[PDB]
Amino acid sequence: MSLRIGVIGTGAIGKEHINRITNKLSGAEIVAVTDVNQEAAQKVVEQYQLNATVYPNDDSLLADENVDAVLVTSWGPAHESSVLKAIKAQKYVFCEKPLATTAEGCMRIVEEEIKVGKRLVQVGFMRRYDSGYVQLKEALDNHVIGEPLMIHCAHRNPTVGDNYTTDMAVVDTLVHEIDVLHWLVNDDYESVQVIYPKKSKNALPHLKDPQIVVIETKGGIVINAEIYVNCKYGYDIQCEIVGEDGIIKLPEPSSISLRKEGRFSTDILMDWQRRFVAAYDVEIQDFIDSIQKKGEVSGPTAWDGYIAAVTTDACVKAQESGQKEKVELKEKPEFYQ
Amino acid sequence: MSLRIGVIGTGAIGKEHINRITNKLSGAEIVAVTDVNQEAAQKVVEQYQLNATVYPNDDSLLADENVDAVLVTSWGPAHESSVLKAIKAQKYVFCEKPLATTAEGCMRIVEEEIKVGKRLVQVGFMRRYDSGYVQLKEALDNHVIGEPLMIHCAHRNPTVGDNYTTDMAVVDTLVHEIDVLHWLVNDDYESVQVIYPKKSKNALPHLKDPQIVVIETKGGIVINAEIYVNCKYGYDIQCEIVGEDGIIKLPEPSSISLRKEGRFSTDILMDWQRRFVAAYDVEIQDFIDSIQKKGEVSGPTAWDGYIAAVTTDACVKAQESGQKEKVELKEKPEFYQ
Amino acid sequence: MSLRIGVIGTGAIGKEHINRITNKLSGAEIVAVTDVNQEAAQKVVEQYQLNATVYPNDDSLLADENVDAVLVTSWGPAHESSVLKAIKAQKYVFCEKPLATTAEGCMRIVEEEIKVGKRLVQVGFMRRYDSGYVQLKEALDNHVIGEPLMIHCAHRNPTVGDNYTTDMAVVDTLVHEIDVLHWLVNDDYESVQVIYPKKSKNALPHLKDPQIVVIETKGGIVINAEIYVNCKYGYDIQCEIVGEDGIIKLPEPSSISLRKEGRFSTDILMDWQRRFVAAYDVEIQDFIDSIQKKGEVSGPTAWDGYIAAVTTDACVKAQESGQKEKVELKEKPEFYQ
Amino acid sequence: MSLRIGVIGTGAIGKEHINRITNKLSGAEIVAVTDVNQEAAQKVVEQYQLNATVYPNDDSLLADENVDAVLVTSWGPAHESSVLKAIKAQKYVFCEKPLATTAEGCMRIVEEEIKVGKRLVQVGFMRRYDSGYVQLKEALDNHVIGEPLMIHCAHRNPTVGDNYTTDMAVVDTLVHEIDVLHWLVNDDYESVQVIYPKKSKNALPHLKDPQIVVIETKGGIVINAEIYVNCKYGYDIQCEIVGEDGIIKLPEPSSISLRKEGRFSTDILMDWQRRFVAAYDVEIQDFIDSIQKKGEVSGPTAWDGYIAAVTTDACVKAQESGQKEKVELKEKPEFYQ
């Protein structure tokens, strides 16, 4: 008997989560949907031949007792509300990033979840499910390189839109690195600093691209993260961890090699959407399996969402002050360990 | 409404196909099972909490009208029977290799399928679904390297069992290369020759390991395939296609790199079972989707099974004669194109 | 017509330069060695069956009207003196790093040379002669990746002795990076910040290891250099240059690949001596050839030695400071461009 | 005390050997050149401002009591003669491949040398001086992968001229492989089979290209070598050795990596001249050094030239035959081990 899932927000990402739950994964189905654009939701239900109730809003959908879990995939600033509602409604919630657009909004969600007494919230930081990052994790966990000391990483995007603005590099783009890194090395951030190199000809005048973000943890690990969203050549994620006795590095995505016209080459992905498809599948399949096999969620926690939110705020501060900002976290409530 | 699947043979592989259909894939369920060891099948149904009828044999299971598709995963020599039955019973059949242990047994299945008037048989040559081989396919299809001229490939296994015998290298091991290569280059085999290098210390006295198999197609492509099932270092699949204007090569499985104690390294898989897990998932998911979206199967055909069987026979001949044997194929019935 | 050469300081590197000039290169011979240890110099004269003269001091060696050029290869502090004399005595001089231990000492040498009217002083920054770096320079000169924006480099070393001190990391180690980088990107530095990650267990109590050095050029290029001299795994030099439209990267030293015991690996050098052996040969040969053909030296200028001296000064300052120290440079004299 | 050297045949390669000895290496000079074209030789004497004598023929050049050694670097057929004279005249001889164009001509040279009592003849198979192959030899000598069982190698070239003929593929091209392989694995050949794949569109009507050459040693090692001289993409040499417990492989030539326009790539050389330039320098230097230190030459022996001559004979035979031709070799004389 399948997990019955209500989706709040039926845009490009909600539609993709609906397609995988419906045609790829196992153990769940979509029974309810709601969208700010109620017409758009109706089209979705028809597009994917769903057996779903179309509601006017999220309270209606959460009111429906036949639904046991929700996917929060609405406009970013809209997330905090639905998450809060679903928690008090005591449903299982998978929330796409961000958990909330402010550190406060995350704190409210943390405080609420601690009441309900168990893990209901899983945040959509999918990198933790990528086979590469999983391997890095296993290696560190087995002490293969001794104590981590430094981390170098890059998040490169071929080109962004006119809409894309300087702060979005940290709040949208760097946010994945921010979650996965502290998860990898089991350490909390302490300071951040932003350094702007010469502008790139490919960046529009209103955008500061590229950027370099330096982040120290409490234990003293030093991270320097390169963000270049108009790098032109492709979509590219790189991550090298330098330990005491060795170095481990994230793999390139699999590609056939080619010998032709003077070059020995492999492919580089252009579309960000193809880089992590496997991690999304595994991320959602786990949300399901975990509930039906543990009566709770297992992925990135509400607390992690808070950490992301705080560190993000610090980065945006550093962005505009050119200073070394501090990352001040509240104590980790034992509820999350 | 899901495809309802009966499984004939509930051993190690049937159990794996049952686990994926039940807990990973989408659009199907197991409703019937049968096994030579009827007790073993009962245990399976309990192990995976299935809603399935346990039958005494395959005619009983095929007689059941509520089942619409079968997985033939029994002892190798047992396949030909169930496949024939399921065809006359007009059910959809996914048959694990071999389709039949003789070229004749394949011909019977081909002749039978052509009667029933549509594609019911899909053979379990999963390599066609591997993302690497798919990329090689796309490149050749796009004429990236011009006409293929030669192919070098290797199928290496760490170590085999006491049970493993010389002929098994071609009938079991090389059989995957035999299917995928002719699929890649759209050409039929014409001759085969086996050359035995110095024996390996890791091979038991009764086994001829390693082996080299040279195969020419009709168009003149020359294949030389290395088989070394006691290579010790790992499980390894390599494939290089040399064209007129360039060279394309199969990727290593993804791994993190390590810098430690004088070496810069990546991992090599030890267990063959981890090499193709993604292709099995995609292979079966396609068997399903195709039926429910086309009213027929789409993968490797009964004819391909025949080709595999014929080429295999030729290789075993060459094995013992040290001669250049001929691969004599009957004309490809238009039913398969 | 062999160029007659005298060596001031038959030390470790002095011995090697003597051996390559004597037994590998073309068009020159050692005719005079002087060492602060008269007996050391004598051992070397018999070591390489040299037909040379042993002098108590440089004055007398330089007085020898035979010597056309000198190799200044003794203690770092003892360089400025020998160099200045050599210029006044108007001999050709190849000086191993550093040119002088003080930014001013180098400016003193800069002036003397300008007077003499031609270039007599070449500094031993051999990296400029490495095929790798030469390839990098070629690609940059050809606009292959457009404008350089960022550079990520690392200089790692298995272990050091009790004598290796925190500042030696920027004085003796990072010095090569500081030279080659500005040569490559054709830009002047401006600021250096030093960031100390968690100290490694492989470092001795008195040493700060690892260290990160961020460096901004006046054009806007940001450079972060990792120095880790107790990395344990091997001796390793990495350099990646991120441009507007692409990325170029320094190769690993050629090594055979090996597949064995679950790993696919290349070799990492364990000894800094082996890393640039070819660069030395090409270096000295150019000294010789340049003189015999043009009547002057060619390599890194005395000015580059000064550029080094200054930059490495700001780094030693940022080591204690913790702040963004400044790099003020005198304007480049007409003499050098 | 420079070794005085005379060059017989100031051709393309003769010019290069003259240039490296004159301007790169140590301990030798060119004092006499003779060419079948008196005016060609004269151009070269002024070309490299040589202080040499121009002789109408080799007899007169060898008569010159100045020359201590000769470089035999003229038309292939014109080698045996010049070599034999040189031995009778008791000079040191470095002979570029081939030693002689007939297996017997080489056996003639073998005998003459044995008489003289020491080794005067070194053959120009420079691959033995390549760091890559040297690394391979080292690993094999150390038993890193246990017993060699198979070797896969390829010799590819962008394009050839109208003059390049089918047999030149084994005479001029595969010849280097034939030498270095037996050196590496310390084994004698035994049989050669030639297999002609589908002919490439880049080959001229009169040429058989590509070709595959299978070769068995008397120890049981199987070697398949691909020769493709119209591969278009570049000049490329590959060599992989499969042992009992591991695999070792020849590196690509060092190149910088580039990420640009959806591709991650290294450079493939376009000109065979650039591939082994270092091997030549090390080759000639060893000729010189070996003589000045030991009073004899060191490299590939006259016997290896004969081993080549024979093997390449069986290959030219298998080219027309189509059968498994035989390689009978005279027993190795005491003189060579």
Ligand SMILES: NC(=O)C1=CN([C@@H]2O[C@H](COP(=O)(O)OP(=O)(O)OC[C@H]3O[C@@H](n4cnc5c(N)ncnc54)[C@H](O)[C@@H]3O)[C@@H](O)[C@H]2O)C=CC1
């Ligand atoms: N580019 C590179 O990778 C390397 C360059 N070097 C540089 O070379 C210099 C020293 O090299 P090492 O052989 O490693 O050290 P070293 O200590 O062995 O060489 C010093 C030797 O020269 C003699 N000496 C010192 N001062 C002298 C003077 N005023 N006159 C005559 N003789 C004198 C000493 O007796 C001693 O034997 C340093 O400046 C160092 O930075 C060192 C190693 C590597």
Ligand SMILES: NC(=O)C1=CN([C@@H]2O[C@H](COP(=O)(O)OP(=O)(O)OC[C@H]3O[C@@H](n4cnc5c(N)ncnc54)[C@H](O)[C@@H]3O)[C@@H](O)[C@H]2O)C=CC1
């Ligand atoms: N190891 C390698 O990669 C290479 C070696 N070679 C070998 O070198 C030889 C020729 O090399 P190339 O310069 O390419 O050809 P080449 O034709 O330019 O050299 C022949 C030259 O020597 C002169 N010559 C011919 N016979 C002579 C004789 N009996 N006495 C005096 N002079 C004579 C001719 O006038 C001509 O100028 C061949 O044996 C070839 O196999 C050629 C190229 C590469």
Ligand SMILES: NC(=O)c1ccc[n+]([C@@H]2O[C@H](COP(=O)([O-])OP(=O)(O)OC[C@H]3O[C@@H](n4cnc5c(N)ncnc54)[C@H](O)[C@@H]3O)[C@@H](O)[C@H]2O)c1
């Ligand atoms: N994990 C990832 O790498 C990843 C990738 C893309 C997007 N996201 C995140 O997922 C969220 C959704 O992204 P998207 O690209 O699908 O957005 P979108 O603009 O394509 O679609 C959002 C949909 O939600 C609806 N909506 C807006 N406000 C709502 C509300 N208050 N209640 C119910 N529905 C509402 C809109 O009508 C729209 O149909 C964003 O917050 C985004 O940051 C995460």
Ligand SMILES: NC(=O)c1ccc[n+]([C@@H]2O[C@H](COP(=O)([O-])OP(=O)(O)OC[C@H]3O[C@@H](n4cnc5c(N)ncnc54)[C@H](O)[C@@H]3O)[C@@H](O)[C@H]2O)c1
């Ligand atoms: N695609 C691949 O790479 C791959 C991998 C493994 C196995 N296979 C093939 O799949 C088949 C099954 O392999 P396996 O390892 O699971 O075998 P197995 O021995 O582990 O199990 C076979 C099961 O089938 C049952 N059986 C035997 N004869 C039967 C019959 N006549 N009718 C019904 N059931 C019968 C047996 O009792 C047993 O439980 C083999 O033919 C094998 O070659 C393919």
